[PDB]
């Protein structure tokens, strides 16, 4: 994993199993995370201040989706019409 100035920003992996059968040839996986990078490159401590484009902020797009999908996944998710859908 790649630390830029103390922050873990990226993971970097060579694959060797997938499913249950070994790999041939092996793959390289690089996975950037683009909100832990932008807070460092911009001097911001709370994601809802990240500048999305010139004029609009990240909070002012995804805040209420962050706020009221939490109430769904956390309190009001009907929990038997999911136990059936699983099977």
């Amino acid at each position: 994993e790649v630390w830029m100035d103390g922050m873990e920003i990226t993971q970097f992996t060579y694959f060797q199993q997938s499913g249950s059968l070994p790999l041939l040839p092996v793959s390289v996986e690089i996975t950037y995370g683009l909100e832990r990078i932008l807070m460092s490159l911009q001097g911001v401590d709370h994601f809802k201040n990240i500048q999305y484009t010139k004029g609009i902020t990240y909070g002012e797009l995804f805040l209420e989706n962050e706020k009221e999908m939490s109430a769904y996944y956390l309190e009001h998710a009907n929990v038997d019409n999911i136990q059936k859908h699983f099977d």
């Binding site: 996975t31 950037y32 683009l34 932008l38 911009q42 990240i50 500048q51 999305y52 484009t53």
Partner: protein, 42 residues
């Protein structure tokens, strides 16, 4: 000035296209990570 959130993408996915990677789109099913998308597990 500083890099905004969409310029980060608009530069990452053109650099990695100069190298030679194909640039696909995301899926249309909810996933928890990226390494389980249909086109990096299969």
């Amino acid at each position: 000035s500083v890099l905004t959130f969409q310029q980060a993408i608009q530069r990452l996915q053109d650099y990695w296209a100069s190298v030679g990677c194909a640039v696909m789109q995301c899926s249309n099913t909810e996933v928890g990570a990226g390494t389980m998308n249909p086109l990096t597990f299969l």
